[PDB]
Design a protein around this nucleic acid. Structure first.
Ligand SMILES: Nc1ccn([C@H]2C[C@H](O)[C@@H](COP(=O)(O)OP(=O)(O)OP(=O)(O)O)O2)c(=O)n1
Ligand SMILES: [Ca+2]
Ligand SMILES: [Mg+2]
Ligand SMILES: [Mg+2]
Length: 342
DNA sequence: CGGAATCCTTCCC
DNA sequence: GGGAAGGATTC
């Protein structure tokens, strides 16, 4: 099993750079504007120029502007980035049928039947990099290992505009020296627990008990690290299908008033149905973010597809249902559709 | 105090 | 033995 993983470098920011070459060299920050206050929202991605100074994904725009007042701040153009992504994803299919596309910017390729060793798995890697650079002007990072996780760790270590193989030795060598928060699927809320638990490196997942580990972080995560540590993990490359689509909006002011909210809910429906595009959902969930910032939802499943009219009808019923079971004032309202037919 | 979507735990009448 | 409402990761 030889796994080759491609992650596009600082994607949104890079597409912007390609589309506007004057942006070459300066800090560029792609933003999600929430719309409550002007400049309310979050940085989605910054190019390396901006990163260098602390402007990174997830931080408030206001914060980013305290650090780099004169950076170029742009709104997200998901529809412009997905064009480029879809094109590159097709380009990658010319190498492997078994291709697992995990995000707008990431794909795994099981290239076992295609190459004979890591040497010339590396060479197929460069052929992949160059072809993207010539075709799209986008630079990518290639990660290569025995399984998906390590192929990805390889990519992280080698970015941006890089290529890295991790053989069976390096795999053993990484099991004992990689920080735990650098393992894919392990984010902040998990990585901080293990700190207190004594766990820092991946090898530590056998330094102490399983019930001590499973007790804090859960069966599937505790198992996951163990199987990686024991050098056992091997999930196959699988074609992924989008499972759900939705849209959440922030209201101008918090409310419990059903009639004041309806316009926001109906707007979320309209955007969701534009996003669906001839995908027909069987389930709708109304999602409501509290004044306390807690996430509350209530859904419904149908034996059939949901016309936009039923969506309008049922969303209200579900909103009313959230109203009867909550005291607080709603800040953010949204809708989620799932269980597609066809 | 952002958006989006995945793959887990999770008790119900 | 489901369901549906929840976490957490990532985007
Ligand atoms: N709090 C966060 C964190 C991340 N992301 C998103 C923005 C990125 O577009 C995406 C992809 O993650 P990558 O690690 O691939 O980051 P980038 O592609 O932006 O840069 P790089 O590839 O150099 O890491 O995750 C987000 O929306 N909100
Ligand atoms: Ca994505
Ligand atoms: Mg990526
Ligand atoms: Mg990337």
């Amino acid at each position: 099993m030889i796994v080759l993983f491609v992650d596009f470098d600082y994607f949104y920011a890079q597409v912007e750079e390609v589309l506007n070459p004057s942006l070459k060299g300066k800090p560029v920050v792609v933003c999600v504007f929430s719309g409550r206050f002007e400049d309310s929202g979050a940085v989605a991605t910054a190019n390396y120029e901006a990163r260098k100074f602390g402007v990174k994904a997830g931080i408030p725009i206001v914060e980013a502007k305290k650090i780099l007042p004169n950076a170029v701040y742009l709104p997200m153009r998901k529809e412009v980035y997905q064009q480029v992504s879809s094109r590159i994803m097709n380009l990658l299919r010319e190498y492997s049928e078994k291709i697992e596309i995990a995000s707008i910017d990431e794909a795994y390729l099981d290239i076992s039947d295609k190459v004979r060793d890591y040497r010339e798995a590396y060479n197929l890697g460069l052929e992949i990099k160059n072809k993207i650079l010539e075709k799209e002007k986008i630079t990518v990072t290639v990660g290569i290992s025995k399984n998906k996780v390590f192929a990805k760790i390889a990519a992280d270590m080698a970015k941006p505009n890089g290529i890295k193989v991790i053989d069976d030795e390096e795999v053993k060598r990484l099991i004992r020296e990689l920080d735990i928060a650098d393992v894919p699927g392990i984010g902040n809320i998990t990585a901080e627990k293990l700190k207190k638990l004594g766990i820092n490196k991946l090898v530590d997942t056998l330094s102490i008990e399983f019930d001590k580990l499973k007790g804090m972080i859960g069966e599937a995560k505790a198992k996951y690290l163990i199987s990686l540590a024991r050098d056992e993990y091997n999930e196959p490359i699988r074609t992924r299908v989008r499972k759900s689509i939705g849209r959440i909006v922030t209201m101008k002011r918090n409310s419990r008033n059903l009639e004041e909210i309806k316009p926001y809910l109906f707007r979320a429906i309209e955007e969701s149905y534009y996003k669906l595009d001839k995908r027909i959902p069987k389930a709708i969930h109304v999602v409501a973010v509290t004044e306390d910032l807690d996430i509350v939802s209530r859904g419904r499943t149908f034996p059939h597809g949901i016309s936009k009219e039923t969506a309008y009808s049922e969303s209200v019923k579900l909103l009313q249902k959230i109203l009867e079971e909550d005291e607080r004032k709603i800040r953010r309202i949204g809708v989620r559709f799932s269980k597609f037919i066809e």
